[PDB]
């Protein structure tokens, strides 16, 4: 997250931190995710497409720090890793960038809700907030484009949803952004998601209820003028999500 604020997991209790184990025992952070039901985390396919081996991955819930334990945290294996079959990537744009991770502890248990671990609501079909709505993003991604390490503490920020008409402008993304994506950015281009924040949640307060409106997917640079963050439009993938859960 470029700019924004350091946060704690109680503020974002659906947030899932996803890591990959490497040959030789080193573990590295891969991507963010959102708990949509006790056994299911939703994320982005681009995060896993080059290493589609579910045994490699570790998922935490209840976790505020990148490389230290948090009280109440819970550690999971991936029982099922489901990537969208029509995923593709262009020069910038990523298509059908959505993934589901069925999680289980070593005891075979799914998530247990607590103060630091809760599910996020899915949106209803074709029900997104109006452009200009403020939504939040969360992640362990880079704070600056010059960083070569991720922050130790979880971050969040607030961005505004941008219309398809604006996002399709020539100096924005042209026809590279589609109606299955949402753009969101800061009017001053001072805050944004960045590399490492992929897969994580774009949460909007939608008719009273905190809703998973987007999944961090792509963008040209980070917090770059006229280059919003682009998000998987969750409300379009409900049938996909329902059949695979």
């Amino acid at each position: 997250i470029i700019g924004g604020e350091f946060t704690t997991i109680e503020n974002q209790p659906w947030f899932a931190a996803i890591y990959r184990r490497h040959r030789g025992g080193s573990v590295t952070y891969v991507c963010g995710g959102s708990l949509i039901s006790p056994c299911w985390v939703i994320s982005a396919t681009h995060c896993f497409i080059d290493y589609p081996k579910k045994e490699d991955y570790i998922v935490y819930l209840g976790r505020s720090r990148l490389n230290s334990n948090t009280q109440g945290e819970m550690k999971f294996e991936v029982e099922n890793l489901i990537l969208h079959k029509d995923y593709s990537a262009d020069t910038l744009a990523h298509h059908n960038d959505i993934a589901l991770l069925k999680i289980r502890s070593k005891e075979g248990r799914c998530a247990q809700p607590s103060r630091t671990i809760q599910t996020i609501a899915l949106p209803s079909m074709y029900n997104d907030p109006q452009f200009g709505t403020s939504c939040e993003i969360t992640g362990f991604g880079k704070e600056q484009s010059t960083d070569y390490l991720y922050p130790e503490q979880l971050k969040m920020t607030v961005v505004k949803l941008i219309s398809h008409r604006e996002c399709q402008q020539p100096h924005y993304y042209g026809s590279e952004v589609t109606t299955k994506m949402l753009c969101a950015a800061d009017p001053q281009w001072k805050t944004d998601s960045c590399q490492g924040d992929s897969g994580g949640p774009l949460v909007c307060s939608l008719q009273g209820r905190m809703t998973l409106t987007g999944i961090v997917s792509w963008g040209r640079g980070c917090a770059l003028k006229d280059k919003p963050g682009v998000y998987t439009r969750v409300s379009h993938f409900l049938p996909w999500i329902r059949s695979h859960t």
Binding site: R20, H46, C47, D50, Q195, G196, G199, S217, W218, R220
Partner: peptide
Amino acid sequence: GXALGRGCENHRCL
């Protein structure tokens, strides 16, 4: 990997 932006996490970049 690529370190070019969102979309590049956990990639094999030969």
